[PDB]
Each structure stands twice: as structure tokens, then as C-alpha cells.
Copies of this chain bind each other. A is one copy, B any other.
Amino acid sequence: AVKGGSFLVDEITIDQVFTPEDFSSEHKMIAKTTEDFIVNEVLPELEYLEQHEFDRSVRLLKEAGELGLLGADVPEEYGGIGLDKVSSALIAEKFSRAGGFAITHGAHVGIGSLPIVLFGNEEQKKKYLPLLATGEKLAAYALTEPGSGSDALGAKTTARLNAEGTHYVLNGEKQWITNSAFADVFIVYAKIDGEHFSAFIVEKDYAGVSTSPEEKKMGIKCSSTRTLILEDALVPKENLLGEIGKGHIIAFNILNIGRYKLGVGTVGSAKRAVEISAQYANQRQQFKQPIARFPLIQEKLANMAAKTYAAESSVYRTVGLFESRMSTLSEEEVKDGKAVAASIAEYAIECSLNKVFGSEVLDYTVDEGVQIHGGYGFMAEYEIERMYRDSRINRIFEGTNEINRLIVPGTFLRKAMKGELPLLQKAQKLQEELMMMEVGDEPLALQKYLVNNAKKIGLMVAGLAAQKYGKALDKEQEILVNIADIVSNLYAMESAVLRTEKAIKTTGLEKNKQKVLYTEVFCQEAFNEIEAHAKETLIAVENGDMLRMMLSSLRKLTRHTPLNVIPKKREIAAKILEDERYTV
């Protein structure tokens, strides 16, 4: 299989990417089953959920449980239905239609249940999973505290073995715990003797466990969110999850999964925003025509759709990498779960990119969706108004986008140290080719060219910054974020290029016109951003004559014949408005 982060340094091929065109009939059916559940059962109640009628959430969760939608990532031997990772991504994508209920569901099947799936011992799995898989029990994940959010290992909740040695005694408060109103089981992190950061399976019914009132939130109002209060909470010794003092291993692994899952979710929402905006544009008339006839409206729709194509392509690529790493695993390995966790941890970089890129694309799409609706976009009666409010938290969830950006360059450098990525050996090849100094004829020739040059620019800039600050590069946050933004744009560009290239080779040029258009337009603009990020970093890192050298090298890497995107965006929009949905 393909190594994590290798896209930056190797010429990835259409055969090495998974795309939505690779979905089986099984994937498509599960997607339709979920969609029908959400549309037929959930949406008619959504307005009561937003009013915190949590009895309805619980009932709906258990109905979802009966359809196998809560147990897709749980193995059959523990009472799950054991679907592949593509299937459970598609389930999350379709759940996004239900606003904050997608958060409820995601916290149950993801951060809440997966710590037991991946790190539970045999006894813990046979006990908890059969019930979690059907929704008979519901789960929540309790890491954050008032004093510890981004710095999640700064938790102040303590755990101390009682005189009898039979139970841990937990004290503290966990903040903003999704599902708290109705969760039966909480994965709680606490420091044993105030020293050793550890995870615990904590039942709601254990002595000393309670919750605060609901938070008043901007959006995702139908998701339950409370503080978990632990006042000599009594947790059986055997409910320790993983090893004493190694709670960070669970938290870090769970985070990766949360990241890409949120990516998939934001992609579902961005598609829905495109759809309702396109339908609105066709019906709303001003100046005696559908506002759909206005180029500025068409332009907003095309930007929204092209970003969504790039997000959808890069997210399912990551899901595909996870699945092909999973392919290697025997049934004993999958059952244990340690190998499943490592199969995704391999792609921690791609997960963080998806999370930041997906949440920002959704941020842009709901914002233009509101603008397309005008004053109706500001009215609670309209679906886009709720989406606008729900979206804002995604840039904060699962690691703020700042933290997610800051960790990307260091992850690359750590992989270069451990010998997983030939970064030094590849950085020195480029130093020569630069002192050595057209495009091609195939469809996508120009975009393939920009993708290749983007890789070189990222490497050049990252190499130069590391050689300049050394081990103290960690303090230069503005630079780190430029590099992270370069890598993120590069990953989305390549994902879009390769997916379109694969489609062409699969179904022809004529049928893949919309993909080609999204690709040309997105690549041009994303490459423009890459160039600006590189310039800012070069200027911060060098000066005088040496800086003019580097800037000419960048100009050489960046020179091409720009496209006229204005008619292309009108062409993209025509098809979106024709289908009244995001289309590919």
C-alpha cells in the first residue's frame, strides 16, 4: 500500500486512489438506506429535537440501531454488523442531512464507541459492544475540561484506587460532553494519583456521577451538551481502558478517526448546501427572472461546487487509504483492534488535512448559501440558516483548525527522522533540478503539471524553513501554518486531478466534462494560494540576494499559461442549476 504523507514526494497514480466512482452496489445501498431513514424518520422530528426533546433522539437512535446504523464499525463477533470503512463513511455523509443529530450519532459510533472497539480487552468488548452496536446503550466521550481544551493532556480530573483496591475513585468535571443527557456509557480520561493520564469506561449509573444543565449553544442545538460531574465517582478497577498512564495513545488514535469522520460529515453538508441553494436560485425571481440567470449567483454556485468536489475527492481518498491498509489484516488482527487503529494512524496527516479542508469548504458553502437566499438566509424558517449556525463549531471540533495546521509540518519531519519518508534525500534532488531548470497534450496536462510543481514548492519552502530555524521551527507558527496550507491545497488538488483522470480512463472525456471543469478551476485558484503562501514564507525566512534567488526559483516553479475561469464557472453552474444538486 501507499505510505502516509508520501503524496508529497511520490508520483501517485490513479490506481493508488480510491474515489466515489469506486463505490460498490453495497456502498450505494447502505447510502440509500441511511438517506431514507434520515429523510423519512428523522427530519419530520428535527424541529422538536432542536427544542431538546431528547426522548425523540433516543427513540430515533434505537430505530437507527435496528437498521444496523449504529453497529457498522463494530465486528460481528461483538454484536456489530462489521461493514467496511467506506460504508461507515457513507453513513456519516448521509447523517449530515440531520444537522446536530449527525453529531449525536457520530459521537455515539465514533469517539464514544471506538475506544472500546479499538482498545477494549476481550471482557470489555463482549460486555459493552453488543449493547452499543444496537443503541441499547448509548455512548459519549469525555476528555475536555474547563482548564484543558486544546491542551487535552492537562486534564485535572483525578483517579485513586480505594482502600479495598476494587474501584477507582474519580473526581473532577468534564466539559461540553456530547450525548450527556442520555448516554449510558462515558469514556472518561483522568490522572491516576493525579499523575498518570488514563482512560476509563464509566457508566452513568455508577455512584457519584451526574451532569450539569444543557449548554445554550449557537448551533447544533439538538445535540445534548453538558458537563459531566464526578464526585467520588466509583469505577470498577476492570473498567480501566488500556494501560495506566497511556491514555494519550487512545486519545491520539481516536482523534485521527474523529478528524476524517468530521471531514466526511462536512462534505455531506456542503453537498446539501449546494442543492438547496441551486433549488432556491431557480425559484426566486428578481428583476423578472430567476436569480439563477445572474452571473454572480452562477459564480457563487460554481465556487461552492468546485470546492465540494475537491473536498469529496480528498476525503474518500483518505477513507480509501485506510481501507487498503485494512485489506492486509487477518480476522484475528481486525478483532483485536490495535491493527485497525494503526491502519488509520498511518494516515494522520491526511486526516488532519481533511478535517481542516472540509470544515473550511463547508464554512464557505453555507456562507454563500445564505447570501444566495438573501434575507431568507437569516430566517430560522429556512434550512440554510440552521446549517450556517451548525457549521461554525466544526472549525473548533476535533482539534481547532489552528492546532490541526500546526501539527502537519512536524508530522512530516518526524516521519523523515524515523525513515518512513525520504524527505532529506528528496529535498536534495530538487536543489539540483532548480539549478538545471512546455506542458503536454493529454486532458488535465496543465493540472498535473501544477500538482507536480506544488509538491516541489512545498518541499522547497518546508526544507528552507527547517534548515533556517532547526529544532526551534515549532515556535514559528505563522510559517508552520503556511506550509500546512500548502500541503492541504496540494492534497486537495492532486485528489481532484487523479479522480478526474481515473474517471476519464474509465468512462471517457465526454461524460466527465463537469469533473474536468471543477478540476481546472479549483487547481488554478488553489495553486495561486500555494504561490502566495510560499512567497510569504520565503520573505520571512531569507533576505537580500539569497531571497531574490529563492523567489526566482519560485517564479520558475510557478510560471504557466493561466486559464480564463469565468466562462468555465458559468458552464459548471449551468449543470448544477439543471440538476438542482451537486453533480459530478
Contacts and interface: CB of A to CB of B under 8 A. Distances in A.
Number of copies: 2
A564 interface: yes
A175 B402 CA distance: 41
A329 interface: no
Contact of A389 (B288, B381, B389, B400): B389
Interface of A is mostly: helix
A378 B393 contact: yes
A287 B151 contact: yes
Interface centre among A149, A286, A299, A375 (most CB of B within 10 A): A375
A396 interface: yes
Contacts of A374: 149-150, 396, 400
Contacts of A33: none
Contacts of A543: 564
A477 interface: yes
A481 B296 contact: yes
A564 B547 CA distance: 11
Interface stretch (A14-22, A60-68, A163-171, A528-536): A528-536
Contacts of A299: 477-478
Q: How large is the interface on A (under 10, 10 to 19, 20 to 34, 35 or more residues)?
A: 35 or more
A217 interface: yes
A543 B566 CA distance: 14
A540 interface: yes
A477 B370 contact: no
Contacts of A370: 392
Contact of A477 (B175, B287, B295, B381): B295
A379 to B, nearest CB: 6
Interface in A278-330: 285-288, 294-296, 299
Nearest to A393: B378
A576 interface: no
Given A287-B151, A294-B477, A296-B477, A402 B371 contact: yes
B381 A287 contact: no
A380 B150 CA distance: 21
A396 B380 contact: no
Given A374-B396, A396-B374, A477-B294, A389 B148 contact: no
A392 B396 contact: no
21 contacts: A144-B375, A150-B286, A154-B286, A154-B287, A154-B288, A216-B379, A217-B380, A218-B379, A218-B385, A295-B475, A295-B476, A295-B478, A370-B392, A374-B396, A375-B393, A388-B392, A389-B389, A478-B569, A528-B532, A539-B564, A540-B566
Closest 3 CB pairs of A and B: A216-B380, A295-B477, A151-B286
Interface of A: 144, 147-151, 154, 175-176, 215-219, 285-288, 294-296, 299, 370-371, 374-375, 377-381, 385, 388-389, 392-393, 395-396, 400-402, 406, 475-479, 481, 528, 532, 535-536, 539-540, 543, 562-566, 569
Given A295-B476, A375-B393, 5 more contacts: A147-B285, A176-B375, A218-B389, A296-B406, A296-B477
